[PDB]
Amino acid sequence: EFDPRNNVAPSMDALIGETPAVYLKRMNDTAATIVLKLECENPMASVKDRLAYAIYDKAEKEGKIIPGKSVIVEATSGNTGIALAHIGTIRGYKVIIVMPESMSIERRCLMRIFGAEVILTPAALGMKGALEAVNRIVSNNPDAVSANQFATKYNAQIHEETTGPEIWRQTKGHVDCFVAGVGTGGTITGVARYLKSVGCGATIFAVEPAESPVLSFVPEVFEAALVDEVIQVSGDEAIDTAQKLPRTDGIFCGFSGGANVYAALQIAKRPEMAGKTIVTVIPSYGERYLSTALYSSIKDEVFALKVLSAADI
Amino acid sequence: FDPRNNVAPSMDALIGETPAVYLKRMNDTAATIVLKLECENPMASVKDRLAYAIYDKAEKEGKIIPGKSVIVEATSGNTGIALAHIGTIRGYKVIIVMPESMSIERRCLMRIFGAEVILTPAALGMKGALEAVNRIVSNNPDAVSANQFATKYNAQIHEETTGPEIWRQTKGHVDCFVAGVGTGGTITGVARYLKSVGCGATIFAVEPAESPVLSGGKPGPHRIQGIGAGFVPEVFEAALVDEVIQVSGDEAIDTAQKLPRTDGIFCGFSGGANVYAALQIAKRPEMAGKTIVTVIPSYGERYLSTALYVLSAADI
Ligand SMILES: *Cc1c(COP(=O)(O)O)cnc(C)c1O
Ligand SMILES: *Cc1c(COP(=O)(O)O)cnc(C)c1O
Ligand SMILES: CC(=O)OC[C@H](N)C(=O)O
Ligand SMILES: OC[C@H]1O[C@H](O)[C@H](O)[C@@H]1O
């Protein structure tokens, strides 16, 4: 509705989306143009802000939830939980996040910082244990709702309505290729739906881990008919790319950003892609992953640094 | 350019023009409180602007030469991160000097952006880091100190960008501006801009009750990372400031812990201090119906491993 550069936003959820895009510069040694959609710039530092926004906005417009009455419940340890907790507290909903006790204490802490009730389930039960706990909570409290049921309904839709149109505007209607990893499938499905709807013939590439190539579970949100090709990227390739992006381009992202950019660079090296514009997504900001395997090699390096003697000063 | 409608040339082109948000649930006063969200900069702090200014203005003055100059600073704080970030983008070597006792996470972040990290013995404190910087600049003809506490570029960037942004966002309704003083660049530059447009806003500096040097007190250790350097920075212009508000560590922390739940604001210690101060000012009868602007300097995620959830100058 408003330019955030020129106005005061009514609340933090009003600053979700309309994220910037940037050219890949130093790392792009190819003949193609690579455009990064910076979902890492959302208020809670990931693409999942848009999904959480959709859930609260659309469910309330359909009368499925009421602030101060409905309780939003989800099994997650990821950015979706953070974003649900964030928007929930702003809008005055109780939020219950269920996750195994074996997940990172940092992720646990982030949910609690936004006042979510965090229900921890035994490590020995895994994600199944968290899903079972959610089922019990939702079934037994008439005012509890499952976020996942709304996420499934609204996920691709929000990307068709926001992410896609933004990309189209930012590139001035120039997209030859779109590359994105599949988590929930929302981003790739909603963007590809949008691009099809505006008559854009862009080729659509899904990215998945070589170590878990299930697209090659399949989320209900994901629409395989919109995808032209699957690129598999190894953990090592994703990590190497994410470790280099800060130095080459000042881009600080997670594992998925590394995978997406690696995939884009592989596509860009194809002769037929010369001079084409390839768009991909940086899903999340890197700082959330500082304690993970993504940056552990750098952590080991700085841990071992020598200290100057007083005599060398 | 409008970022909503164009592709940026580089990440340093997305610095500044940050959003602003009303403080709503936490604000029980008769004043309007506007938060300038410096936490939304690309490297998640106000220091992106200072780093941008240093590289942009130093190059325009010929004080750095691309592919020759090496940028040096003694810092484990946001200034070092931002210097390393813009340095690597522009192709400058960056050397960050810090006491060995500063956070390993901050050390790691400098190195992620390709800065060289020099560690100084903790028994020498910040003096030891400053001495190492002086040795680098004296002995290395190509080395240039960022000089964050004294450089003219600091207040200048805030006079040119942060101030005009606040003026535009509030549509010329700024009755009060409240900001914690680290380098003093933000408050000085914003106050300079507001003065230049004939705005009679009252200007409030915030400092730790534990280290109230702007108030004429003694330096001391405190938890409010980003502010309270333990001396009066050269950048800071006391003549522009109407009052200094002291905030305790406990008050700053309490506020920063509540802001995420009340208003979805996820910030560090200094954002808590600023908001606490703004709310204290806002209770004054003369502030009824007035617009008070303060700053959220940095995003909260950088503080997850800290106490939030002297060495003070090194945390800037
Ligand atoms: C959500 C997410 C993705 C995938 O986006 P989808 O819309 O779920 O397909 C991958 N990376 C990160 C870090 C994200 O949070
Ligand atoms: C730099 C810093 C400030 C203070 O800003 P100055 O312009 O240096 O006075 C406050 N808090 C944080 C987190 C900082 O990094
Ligand atoms: C990877 C991420 O942060 O998101 C994944 C998803 N939000 C989950 O519940 O795991
Ligand atoms: O890039 C600046 C950081 O704070 C902002 O909120 C972004 O989401 C990101 O995590």
Numbering used by the authors:
A (entry chain A): 17 to 232, 248 to 344
B (entry chain B): 18 to 326, 338 to 344
Show the paper's wording.
The de novo pathway of cysteine biosynthesis requires the conversion of O-acetyl-l-serine into l-cysteine, which is catalysed by cysteine synthase (CS). As CS is not found in humans, it constitutes a potential drug target. Crystal structures of the three enzymes were determined at resolutions of 1.80 Å for TcCS, 1.75 Å for LiCS and 2.75 Å for TthCS. These three homodimeric structures show the same overall fold and demonstrate that the active-site geometry is conserved, supporting a common reaction mechanism.
